[PDB]
Amino acid sequence: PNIKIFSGSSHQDLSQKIADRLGLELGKVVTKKFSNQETCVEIGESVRGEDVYIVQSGCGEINDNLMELLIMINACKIASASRVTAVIPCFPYARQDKKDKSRAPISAKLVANMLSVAGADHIITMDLHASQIQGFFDIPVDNLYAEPAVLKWIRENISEWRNCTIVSPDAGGAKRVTSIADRLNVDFALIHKEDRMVLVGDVKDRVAILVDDMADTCGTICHAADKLLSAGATRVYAILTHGIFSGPAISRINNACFEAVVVTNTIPQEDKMKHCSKIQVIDISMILAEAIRRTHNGESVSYLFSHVP
Amino acid sequence: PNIKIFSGSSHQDLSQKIADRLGLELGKVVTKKFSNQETCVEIGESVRGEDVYIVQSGCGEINDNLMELLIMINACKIASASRVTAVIPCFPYARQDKKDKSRAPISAKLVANMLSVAGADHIITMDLHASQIQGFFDIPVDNLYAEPAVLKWIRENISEWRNCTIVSPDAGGAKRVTSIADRLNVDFALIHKEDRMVLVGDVKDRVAILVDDMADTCGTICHAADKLLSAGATRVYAILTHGIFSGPAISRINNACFEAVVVTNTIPQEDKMKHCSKIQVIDISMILAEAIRRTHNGESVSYLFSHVP
Amino acid sequence: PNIKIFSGSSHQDLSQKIADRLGLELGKVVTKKFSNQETCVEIGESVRGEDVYIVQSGCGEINDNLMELLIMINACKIASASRVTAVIPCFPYARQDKKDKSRAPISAKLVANMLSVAGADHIITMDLHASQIQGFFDIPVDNLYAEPAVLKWIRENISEWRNCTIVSPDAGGAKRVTSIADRLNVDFALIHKEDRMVLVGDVKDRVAILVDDMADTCGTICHAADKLLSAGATRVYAILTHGIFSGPAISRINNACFEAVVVTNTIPQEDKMKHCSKIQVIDISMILAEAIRRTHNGESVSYLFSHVP
Amino acid sequence: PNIKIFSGSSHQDLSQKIADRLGLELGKVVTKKFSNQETCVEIGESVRGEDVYIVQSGCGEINDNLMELLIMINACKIASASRVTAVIPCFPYARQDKKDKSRAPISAKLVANMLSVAGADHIITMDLHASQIQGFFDIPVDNLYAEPAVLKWIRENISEWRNCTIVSPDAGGAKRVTSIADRLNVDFALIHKEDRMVLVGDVKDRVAILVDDMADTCGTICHAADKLLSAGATRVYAILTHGIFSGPAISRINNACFEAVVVTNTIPQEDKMKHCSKIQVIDISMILAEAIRRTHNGESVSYLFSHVP
Amino acid sequence: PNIKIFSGSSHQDLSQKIADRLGLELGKVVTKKFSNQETCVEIGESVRGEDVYIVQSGCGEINDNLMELLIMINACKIASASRVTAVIPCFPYARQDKKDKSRAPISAKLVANMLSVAGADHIITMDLHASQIQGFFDIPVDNLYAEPAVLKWIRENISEWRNCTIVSPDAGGAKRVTSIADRLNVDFALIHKEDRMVLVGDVKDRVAILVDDMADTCGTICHAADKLLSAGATRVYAILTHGIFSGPAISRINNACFEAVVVTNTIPQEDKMKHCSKIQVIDISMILAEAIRRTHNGESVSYLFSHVP
Amino acid sequence: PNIKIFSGSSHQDLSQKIADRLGLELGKVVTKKFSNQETCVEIGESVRGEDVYIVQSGCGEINDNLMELLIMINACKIASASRVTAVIPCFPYARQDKKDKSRAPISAKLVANMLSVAGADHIITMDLHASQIQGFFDIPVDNLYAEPAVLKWIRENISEWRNCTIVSPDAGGAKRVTSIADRLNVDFALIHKEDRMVLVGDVKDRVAILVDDMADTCGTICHAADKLLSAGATRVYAILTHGIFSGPAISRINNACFEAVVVTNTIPQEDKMKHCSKIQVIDISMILAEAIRRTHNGESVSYLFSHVP
Ligand SMILES: Nc1ncnc2c1ncn2[C@@H]1O[C@H](COP(=O)(O)OP(=O)(O)OP(=O)(O)O)[C@@H](O)[C@H]1O
Ligand SMILES: Nc1ncnc2c1ncn2[C@@H]1O[C@H](COP(=O)(O)OP(=O)(O)OP(=O)(O)O)[C@@H](O)[C@H]1O
Ligand SMILES: Nc1ncnc2c1ncn2[C@@H]1O[C@H](COP(=O)(O)OP(=O)(O)OP(=O)(O)O)[C@@H](O)[C@H]1O
Ligand SMILES: Nc1ncnc2c1ncn2[C@@H]1O[C@H](COP(=O)(O)OP(=O)(O)OP(=O)(O)O)[C@@H](O)[C@H]1O
Ligand SMILES: Nc1ncnc2c1ncn2[C@@H]1O[C@H](COP(=O)(O)OP(=O)(O)OP(=O)(O)O)[C@@H](O)[C@H]1O
Ligand SMILES: Nc1ncnc2c1ncn2[C@@H]1O[C@H](COP(=O)(O)OP(=O)(O)OP(=O)(O)O)[C@@H](O)[C@H]1O
Ligand SMILES: [Mg+2]
Ligand SMILES: [Mg+2]
Ligand SMILES: [Mg+2]
Ligand SMILES: [Mg+2]
Ligand SMILES: [Mg+2]
Ligand SMILES: [Mg+2]
Ligand SMILES: [Mg+2]
Ligand SMILES: [Mg+2]
Description:
Strand order of the largest sheet of chain A: 10-9-8-11-12-13-14
EC number (chains A, B, C, D, E, F): 2.7.6.1
Shape of chain A: globular
Cofactor (chains A, B, C, D, E, F): Mg(2+)
Bound molecules: adenosine-5'-triphosphate, magnesium ion
Largest sheet of chain A: 7 strands, mixed
Organism (chains A, B, C, D, E, F): Homo sapiens
Binding site for Mg(2+) (chains A, B, C, D, E, F): 127, 129, 138, 142
GO molecular function (chains A, B, C, D, E, F): ATP binding; identical protein binding; kinase activity; magnesium ion binding; protein homodimerization activity; ribose phosphate diphosphokinase activity
Oligomer: homohexamer
Radius of gyration of chain A: 20 Å
């Protein structure tokens, strides 16, 4: 059983980077639309008895990409692939992980059920919005972390990183920032709203680094950055694993005081970089490629939680 | 347990017509998109212990509508609805009902599995592309027929209907046309391609009526109509239950010789009628409403296969 | 189909209170242990065609109680009960809702799967540790809130409640306290550890009310209370929906500065009240009884999120 | 994991031919009936960790053979076989693949469900009546085609094959005949009933070859052959992949004008050949053996759609 | 939801008796065979929203009857019956309930799985060979007992019943006979083989009554009766709930010393009574009818374990 | 894929013996209790792609051990183990394998369902109380037999074993004793209660050996031994595969006439041996180790039914 990497249409550059790091060519697949806009998928090579990995992120036209992924999984499964793995760098509907006093769907659970029923045997993803989403599955889920790559970027790009403060934009992400603060041996601050925000932790004359899983409309991080500059911070960075940047995010970032907005490439960023000078991209294709290769060879994946490959 | 009718965003006029025929108001639901284009659904009223019917056709932005339907089904199911029924007038991915010497998905089966796993207890649909799709489910599926309404339209709109010929555009649909030919006591002709088409059955000086389940790009029916005019037909009609009309269909119909292109309203048609004068719409909301009401009350649904309500 | 309420051995007083509020007698069931300590269950009355509710909390001997609940559910399901509902005021293994960089089980998901496979059709619980646990099920889950009863207690027991500060012991519970702070129109403070704790929000000369879902060993709330007294608070209360009080909790509370430690009766408290004077109990049996009665009659359960019955 | 081939009682000659082509001996199994006519199955060798293939066609005493197959699958699955594959050359109940305005079962779907629940991991079959039956499964199904062997037979047995006409007995099978007509570069004709039949396509002074998936009572092919002789055909052949030949088929064929009735050996034919001189048998055991060997070794099976091995 | 009783072809007299006791007519169903011997089923009336009971015993052509039952269940389930119950007086493959050091199927479990996957919601049966078969299902199973009817027959037909001895033919059935011996206040004896049999319990000058669940070949009961006459018994009776009587059973009974061989009518007996004078039939249609009516109305079924209705 | 053996807390000595016989070290796992007595499990090494065997018997605190086993299975399954096998020497709730005229659970079936839903792929157990429990699973179950080890012990410990009588304590176990009696070529006796017991078979001046699957309270075997001494037996032995010894068993055995009470070590016995001199232990760790090694290597397990390794 050999590795076969297939790309959905969502993030083809990431799939190519992963394939190069694995020393493989992308599997032959046609993924287009019929005239009535139904997804058309044709696997152009035999996957019989192979270990198939389908790379598709929850970005762009999310429902189209999700249906493409489900259809590709189904096609590979009924084509007698030995194992089918969904590599989903940004998990769609992850923020709908609970009801919370509303007659709302748990869309993340529905997506997990659909992936299971399509025939996925395994899920590889990066920085799930809530790690409880792992429990939405009955198949194994490897939730990778961008934190090693983030730490690497911080050390090689922020000269004052030993005196910086890692800041959570809200009370929800504090855990994450504390982890980073532990790995860098720096202070960590929290910010939460009472339209006013309150900040705990000295940030004067120090570089502040907001850290988060995602930036969708960037209202949260822009408000946090305004507060950090109010409290005497020297420069404010924002580091996010998922740069969705929908709606007014680009305009707000352009009008914000960030020195840089670093995001990983779990979502393609070329279009946003055109209209926003301060967006920078961390490659995480090495982490994804190593996770694929370790799941295939039966090596430890959790080794990657703390080690940059 | 009362009837609750909910509308997806795909076909709101049809849902309203069904609700009026049932003497009900449409259930309060918010169906919009988040900024990153994920579907947002909020059920605005309690559905606890109710018989819920969600109306959504496989039309327009098909993957968006399908995800909306799945999310709404999930929301109603975890909101403790007694029973959830999907009313899908045009079934999405119905034409991908087999592989046939290709490494292709069976997308119709995947859609059926997704509907089941979302929590659908029952499916109501009209003129499935292949009735074998009923076997793709383990829940009951009521596949209604537009044929009674088509027969009614033919009798009240074609003055020469007693001397007409019902024509299949291809060998696949012959069964359907024979059924119609049996109910009208008229001749039935077949047409199949060898770029040339061959026609069996006298059509000279007689009105010809092409009959089909759907018109997507209308290449099939336009070629058939050209052949029918070649063979001396007086006027050529086309009657289809599903008017998808994607791609170049409107231009081809405008350049074709059809007296009329009659379609049911399983798919909204207002935009197409603007650009195509010869499209006409049969209302089938009475059939759908009667099917909903009969499934709710435990009356016979198959009664509708031959009776216009 | 009538309501049948059955009690597990974990919390018989709560089951009796619920049964009285419903105007019913507890169903005849024998729940003992065989000599080799296997659970023995015998349903002493016919439950055929009935709406069965089994009350069992995740307290005391947790694995014994959980197995008792599963066995009782199975016995009722194979005895042809029309519907079986598990009323689990405190959900066992709720704190094991994720893996988080550890080769650990997701025990909450396992418990959900076991409840589903035993035959539960519905779950009623109170203040799930994480509401994402709702997504661990495919059956409906009604997660009730003790907040209405807590607000009632605060108003009728704390004379200075209009000038009080609602305090979260950690960043995780802030949402909850904000909700309470919104319903009382008072200030809300956060506390988080950097062995030192940092507090945001004025608490001097004001009554402080720590709020939380559970108190197991009470290290968190005792440290928070020490910090609140350091910051000039007048009196410190603690209000928790689940009073587990395991390990050294009673000694720590006895040595702490709390004016009172209010907990709901989702877990029996009589033994702890003997050794701890400042524990007080809020009855939530009315909320549970109303939820049972509303699920049975098909009325709105979410009505209870904001209304004391 | 090695190949183990087991024979049901339905078609032992085919199983032996497949085993010889694989270079294997048939696995030791006892398949008899108890006194009360219940199937008795005993696997006479260990299948632990093996790739098991059970050969059983839907022929003869169909319900007995189907139950034998299910029981053998179950016995191998609980005996810890690594993988169990059902090799079903003629799929039982394949013609009950839809309801079609009748309160009828979808028996093909029921058979698929029973095969899945017995523990089949994979299905190998030949010329499914409708390829939509593939969607009735969630396990992979390889639907082989007798067409390569049919083309070989036509070329080596019909001297005038370059000037022949391939004829469909009905509108349903046209696809199949067109495929054959494409591979031979000959004309293709259709025949359909209006008790009268209409034929399109010149057949005078040319050899006609009716092609079909199965012949049960042979009314269809006998009527088609009568019509072909009416239209001036020189000789009429019939080629079917499944020679069921039930009821009056043998008498009708004996009284028909066929030069030969060629069928594959998916169903044993020795008894029918005794009473019908013009039946001839194509061996397809090479196709089945190659499909088994390619599924075992992870090679391409679809290679066989166009290549005789 | 009303009761609908449908008969399979296995035991039509029993179905009619049950229908008369329920005050109902048998539901319109066609159950025949296609030419190729596949089961053909057509439900001749709407079962939508009804409580359907299908009566079919594991007798005669067992695999044909079992397939008929599965097909009828499937037809009713996809016809939107509210509930489908299989009434199986004699459960097929019940004696294959374990493997026991053999590479054998557990055919009873396979049958249970097939019944569940066909769509059965409930099973009613009489005197399961092993009551552990109840655990083979996940749906409720009501296993009725012929013992009340047997006790009635014994009292009204054996004048010396107060001084009789109830005898088990083997060690396996002892429980059953003890139950009967308890309800009659008589002695109970056991017989087991060491070709020789050993009997415990005085039987001289007393009427002996062998009791058993089934008689297939009647070797067991004939050997037991020979031993009982050896030990000085006056008359020997045999009472069995299931009179299968396959193979040489009729000849052996004719050559045996039984005064009577009483069996219930879970299996049709008219043909066997023609060739065997000493077979007598107990009607158990009242027990089956009462069980159906009590499951429908939600009354206690276990009431029937001790009460003749 | 390598063998990984993990021990639950129930029987660590047995797990160590098995690990030594396999030439392996026990896998690193932490199995403790949280403060509130919930099971805490942490797998201390990667099990990705491994063949995992978890050893846990149904002994001691049965519900705690069962929950530990389920949690460990779940942890290994979501840690991407290739295969997870539960090695359960004494199966919990095995005696609750049926309902039998009681509104009781089938707890054995519930346990089987829970093991399956936790993710077990395979079960290895010894002397199931009823072999029908094998049918409670859909995964393969290997039910090993202590009989080879028992025969070995009898030959090497009872000098008069050629003239002994193997005695069943009840009618239920007769099969077992007959098997042993066949393998030793000795007489076999039965004992059953009418408070009086009746014995068939000469036992005077001969050593008697009671044989059974388990001894819980030892009332059965103590009464049987009293009867055997009444009937002139010289010495009475008892041999049981499962020595549960709960309740008053130790006192009764101490007051009984047994020469020895031999049990296997499927359950730890050190504590009972302290208070009971006549308990002796047969090691069956070789049988379990050989079964594990044969399932891993795909060799025959049933070879062990008759051969001591
Ligand atoms: N794609 C989306 N875009 C925007 N909002 C979304 C999206 N999906 C869900 N939501 C909504 O966003 C809210 C969830 O917000 P968020 O995840 O930031 O906070 P939380 O879950 O309440 O708390 P926290 O993550 O801090 O523990 C819900 O109301 C949910 O319905
Ligand atoms: N939405 C779609 N639009 C266009 N083509 C589609 C769509 N979905 C599937 N197809 C393709 O269309 C083909 C199916 O065509 P069609 O249903 O007209 O004929 P058929 O199934 O071969 O025969 P028939 O319906 O006459 O029995 C397949 O190749 C399928 O992949
Ligand atoms: N019964 C239990 N008693 C104590 N600790 C437990 C128990 N069950 C699980 N845990 C452990 O407690 C930790 C979970 O702690 P907790 O719920 O307080 O914080 P969190 O989930 O990390 O964050 P938060 O709830 O603030 O969002 C995990 O390490 C888990 O293994
Ligand atoms: N074993 C059988 N023998 C005979 N008739 C059968 C059998 N099984 C099902 N049938 C019936 O035969 C009919 C199906 O016929 P057939 O497959 O020839 O045509 P179709 O499915 O209507 O169309 P087509 O295959 O041309 O697209 C149905 O009425 C079905 O109930
Ligand atoms: N229909 C059948 N006719 C005859 N024998 C059968 C049938 N089905 C299974 N058997 C076989 O009969 C045997 C089962 O026999 P039986 O039920 O009389 O005894 P048991 O299960 O060993 O013990 P007991 O029922 O006394 O506890 C098995 O070998 C089984 O394979
Ligand atoms: N752990 C247990 N300890 C004691 N009794 C139990 C236990 N579990 C179940 N029981 C009860 O013990 C009885 C089962 O007894 P037992 O297995 O000895 O006999 P049986 O199943 O009736 O017949 P036999 O095994 O001889 O065929 C049932 O009433 C069951 O509820
Ligand atoms: Mg969130
Ligand atoms: Mg956030
Ligand atoms: Mg088609
Ligand atoms: Mg078509
Ligand atoms: Mg907390
Ligand atoms: Mg045909
Ligand atoms: Mg018997
Ligand atoms: Mg016993």
